[PDB]
Amino acid sequence: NINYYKDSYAASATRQDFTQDPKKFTQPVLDSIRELSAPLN
Amino acid sequence: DPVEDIIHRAISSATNVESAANTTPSSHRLETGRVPALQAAETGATSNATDENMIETRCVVNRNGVLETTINHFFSRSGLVGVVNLTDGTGYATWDIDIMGFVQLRRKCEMFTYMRFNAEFTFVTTTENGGARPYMLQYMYVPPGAPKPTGRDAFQWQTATNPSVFVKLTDPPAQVSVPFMSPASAYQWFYDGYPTFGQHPETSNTTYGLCPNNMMGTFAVRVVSREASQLKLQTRVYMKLKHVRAWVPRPIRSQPYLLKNFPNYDSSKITNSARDRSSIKQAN
Amino acid sequence: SDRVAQLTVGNSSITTQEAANIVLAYGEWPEYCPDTDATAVDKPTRPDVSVNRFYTLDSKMWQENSTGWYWKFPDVLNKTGVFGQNAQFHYLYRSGFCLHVQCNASKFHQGALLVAVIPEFVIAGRGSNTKEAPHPGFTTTFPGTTGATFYDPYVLDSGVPLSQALIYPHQWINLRTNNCATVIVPYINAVPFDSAINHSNFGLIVIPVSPLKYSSGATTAIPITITIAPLNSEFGGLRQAVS
Amino acid sequence: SDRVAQLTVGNSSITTQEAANIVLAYGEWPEYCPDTDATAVDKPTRPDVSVNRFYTLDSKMWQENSTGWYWKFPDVLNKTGVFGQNAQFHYLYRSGFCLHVQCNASKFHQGALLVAVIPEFVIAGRGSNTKEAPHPGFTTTFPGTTGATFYDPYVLDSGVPLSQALIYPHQWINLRTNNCATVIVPYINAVPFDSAINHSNFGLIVIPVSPLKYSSGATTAIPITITIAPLNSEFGGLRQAVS
Numbered sequence: 025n026i027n028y029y030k031d032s033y034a035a036s037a038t039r040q041d042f043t044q045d046p047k048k049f050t051q052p053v054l055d056s057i058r059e060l061s062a063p064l065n
Numbered sequence: 066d067p068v069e070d071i072i073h074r075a076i077s078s079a080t081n082v083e084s085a086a087n088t089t090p091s092s093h094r095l096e097t098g099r100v101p102a103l104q105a106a107e108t109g110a111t112s113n114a115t116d117e118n119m120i121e122t123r124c125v126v127n128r129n130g131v132l133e134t135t136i137n138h139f140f141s142r143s144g145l146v147g148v149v150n151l152t153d154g155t156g157y158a159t160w161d162i163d164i165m166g167f168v169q170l171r172r173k174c175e176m177f178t179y180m181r182f183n184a185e186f187t188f189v190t191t192t193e194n195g196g197a198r199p200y201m202l203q204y205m206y207v208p209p210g211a212p213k214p215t216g217r218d219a220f221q222w223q224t225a226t227n228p229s230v231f232v233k234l235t236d237p238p239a240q241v242s243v244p245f246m247s248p249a250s251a252y253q254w255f256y257d258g259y260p261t262f263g264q265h266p267e268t269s270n271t272t273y274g275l276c277p278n279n280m281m282g283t284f285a286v287r288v289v290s291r292e293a294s295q296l297k298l299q300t301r302v303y304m305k306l307k308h309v310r311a312w313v314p315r316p317i318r319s320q321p322y323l324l325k326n327f328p329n330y331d332s333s334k335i336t337n338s339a340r341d342r343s344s345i346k347q348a349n
Numbered sequence: 350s351d352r353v354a355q356l357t358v359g360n361s362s363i364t365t366q367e368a369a370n371i372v373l374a375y376g377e378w379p380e381y382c383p384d385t386d387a388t389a390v391d392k393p394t395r396p397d398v399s400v401n402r403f404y405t406l407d408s409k410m411w412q413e414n415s416t417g418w419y420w421k422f423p424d425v426l427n428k429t430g431v432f433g434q435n436a437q438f439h440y441l442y443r444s445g446f447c448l449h450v451q452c453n454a455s456k457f458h459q460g461a462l463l464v465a466v467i468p469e470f471v472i473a474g475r476g477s478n479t480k481e482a483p484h485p486g487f488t489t490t491f492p493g494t495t496g497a498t499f500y501d502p503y504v505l506d507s508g509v510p511l512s513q514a515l516i517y518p519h520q521w522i523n524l525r526t527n528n529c530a531t532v533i534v535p536y537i538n539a540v541p542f543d544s545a546i547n548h549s550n551f552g553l554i555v556i557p558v559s560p561l562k563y564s565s566g567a568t569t570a571i572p573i574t575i576t577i578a579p580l581n582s583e584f585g586g587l588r589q590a591v592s
Numbered sequence: 593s594d595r596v597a598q599l600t601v602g603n604s605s606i607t608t609q610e611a612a613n614i615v616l617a618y619g620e621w622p623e624y625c626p627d628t629d630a631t632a633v634d635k636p637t638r639p640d641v642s643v644n645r646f647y648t649l650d651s652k653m654w655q656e657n658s659t660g661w662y663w664k665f666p667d668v669l670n671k672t673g674v675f676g677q678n679a680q681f682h683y684l685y686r687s688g689f690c691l692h693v694q695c696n697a698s699k700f701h702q703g704a705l706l707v708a709v710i711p712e713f714v715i716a717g718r719g720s721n722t723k724e725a726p727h728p729g730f731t732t733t734f735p736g737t738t739g740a741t742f743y744d745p746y747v748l749d750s751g752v753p754l755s756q757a758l759i760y761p762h763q764w765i766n767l768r769t770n771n772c773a774t775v776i777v778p779y780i781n782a783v784p785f786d787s788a789i790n791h792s793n794f795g796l797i798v799i800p801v802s803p804l805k806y807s808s809g810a811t812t813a814i815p816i817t818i819t820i821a822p823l824n825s826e827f828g829g830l831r832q833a834v835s
């Protein structure tokens with residue numbers, strides 16, 4: 025968490041991201057489907 | 066009172082996930098109407114059948130790490146992007162900064178369409194027999210539009226405005242940081258378009274796919290001396306992607322590579338993605 | 350209540366009775382450019398009825414030995430309608446789309462299509478040269494309303510395999526389940542506005558994975574029609590016409 | 593919401609999309625033996641995953657002139673899996689079952705099966721002797737996994753007519769309506785525990801009442817598979833192996 029320059033891009037790697045959001049790639053549909061039901065009815 | 070019709074969200078939700086997912090215990094299902102095994106792949110969605118609804122599972126408190134798989138820890142590993150050959154006795158050498166020429170780091174970067182990163186270059190300069198001779202070098206950075214040097218002792222090496230690095234061969238290798246220098250808001254590796262207007266030809270249009278938002282300049286190198294010393298050099302440039310953001314994933318390359326700027330392949334020799342076996346009805 | 354749908358945009362409407370679902374590309378809706386992301390200093394035009402409507406292209410006959418097809422968007426609509434006239438008088442361009450591929454077949458036919466949307470779909474050349482080198486013609490890269498057939502659909506004509514091409518927004522047209530695929534796509538580009546003549550953003554692709562088979566006596570002519578529609582389209586930089 | 597079902601027991605699961613309903617035999621669920629009805633003084637073993645799962649038997653081809661079939665339970669599972677090893681090391685035995693008979697056919701086929709469950713199904717001999725007398729062989733009474741075809745399905749090979757055999761727990765497999773029959777059976781015996789080698793409790797029976805008919809050109813091979821599963825099984829009296 026240290027930097028010796030005033031330029032913010034000369035620093036090391038920043039804090040960890042820890043998030044992911046897979047619902048935009050796995051299930052990108054309008055009618056949200058459940059698990060325990062038939063997807064086509 | 067006036068004309069009325071002049072008066073007249075998303076789906077995904079990100080969660081901070083630390084470790085891998087757990088498993089809750091299950092039981093047996095003996096009932097009709099509720100089925101988790103039947104899917105429909107035509108809806109464009111993936112299957113959502115979890116393993117608690119297929120079999121009977123136990124309670125597992127999972128403590129595995131999902132840290133090294135992020136896009137920062139995946140790209141912050143410096144690899145070779147260019148080799149500059151300098152034979153002294155024109156006296157200098159240039160290198161158009163294009164990292165699409167070496168294939169270890171190219172294929173990692175072709176997973177995505179748009180990337181926004183900072184870089185961290187490193188220049189490992191040796192002789193042709195191994196290195197370590199006490200001569201002094203100069204590495205200029207020539208932005209697009211700046212005059213490239215035209216001689217071993219020309220006036221463009223005065224370097225009053227653009228950056229430069231003086232380092233000997235016997236020092237540790239020089240290392241700088243480079244910001245996001247594109248005029249757009251992301252480096253795009255695939256540009257389906259033409260740079261200029263006009264009538265585009267049918268035979269050989271060498272401008273299809275040229276993205277001028279990625280051309281970042283020229284890297285020049287000489288030996289800081291008056292009389293021409295006689296020693297052959299090679300530099301090796303190592304780029305480390307840091308502070309990196311990526312958009313719009315795409316499939317990974319499966320065909321062998323051909324040109325730097327163009328995604329060519331040969332159609333007469335298309336390599337299959339899966340190596341062959343004897344028949345379909347046996348596994349080994 | 351899920352197989353029946355109607356899509357009214359502008360003065361046009363599409364009904365369907367054997368649909369599957371509707372896919373939003375990457376979970377987002379097409380919208381106008383906000384003020385915190387705009388870089389031009391002129392006021393844009395927003396026609397909003399005359400350019401946001403379902404344009405129906407021509408039909409592609411699907412046969413036994415079809416190797417597949419691709420269009421470029423917004424290349425196919427630069428010469429049709431008032432969208433084709435606003436995209437020539439104006440230098441800048443921004444829109445979304447709403448795609449719909451119709452293909453019906455009886456209860457005795459079989460096969461499957463892959464209808465996907467590929468952002469920045471760059472066509473590759475087909476030579477074993479390491480520099481001169483072969484490059485695709487202008488009617489191959491920017492085909493227009495007549496599309497273009499693939500030469501090598503296994504690698505999508507870009508050295509990139511079809512088996513992983515389900516990472517893009519897509520649906521399937523399985524002839525025993527549905528007859529239509531609908532994909533709604535936002536504006537995906539690295540700049541807020543860009544030209545509609547040089548740069549085509551993405552490319553619709555329909556490739557038959559499992560081939561069309563039918564017993565003798567059935568109807569032999571199975572066409573594939575494609576009906577597309579811009580959404581939230583706006584233009585800028587008025588000048589004279591350049592096609 | 594009634595034609596679609598899934599049955600997950602153990603590590604195995606059965607899906608169906610054209611079912612009818614699920615029948616509990618005599619309105620009761622298989623359970624463990626209570627302490628007020630137990631007569632042994634040892635502790636029983638209850639594996640509960642390794643023995644409660646769907647075992648799939650072999651397939652029976654159904655033809656024009658089939659006179660029908662019968663298995664004995666738990667005879668068919670004394671040699672398959674860990675249920676077949678717990679039923680040999682242990683003298684005592686108690687379980688329920690969950691049966692499932694799959695038989696699919698197209699929209700141009702016709703016929704009907706009768707899938708019933710007969711407690712204490714005793715095979716009769718076929719002679720006009722009043723004492724010597726004919727008695728059925730051991731592979732006819734206790735057939736195993738390969739079953740046995742009826743000789744006289746009209747009297748169920750026991751002098752007892754089929755027309756009244758709907759008093760047992762049963763379903764129908766009518767090829768225009770469904771394709772599978774499911775019967776869940778508790779433990780029905782006069783003693784709390786009994787041996788699994790000498791005494792088979794009940795017998796599953798599949799008899800085609802209306803015959804299989806199909807027009808020319810259709811698929812001629814219609815198989816009948818049977819997938820059964822023990823439920824709430826427990827054993828007692830450990831000793832050496834007797835088959």
Ligand SMILES: CCCCCCCCCCCCC/C=C/[C@H](O)[C@H](N)CO
Nearest residue numbers: 162163164204205206230243252279281
């Ligand atoms: C004395 C320091 C000289 C070295 C400084 C180099 C700065 C220029 C680096 C710009 C950022 C990386 C260049 C762009 C990346 C890819 O090669 C291009 N996008 C090619 O498509």
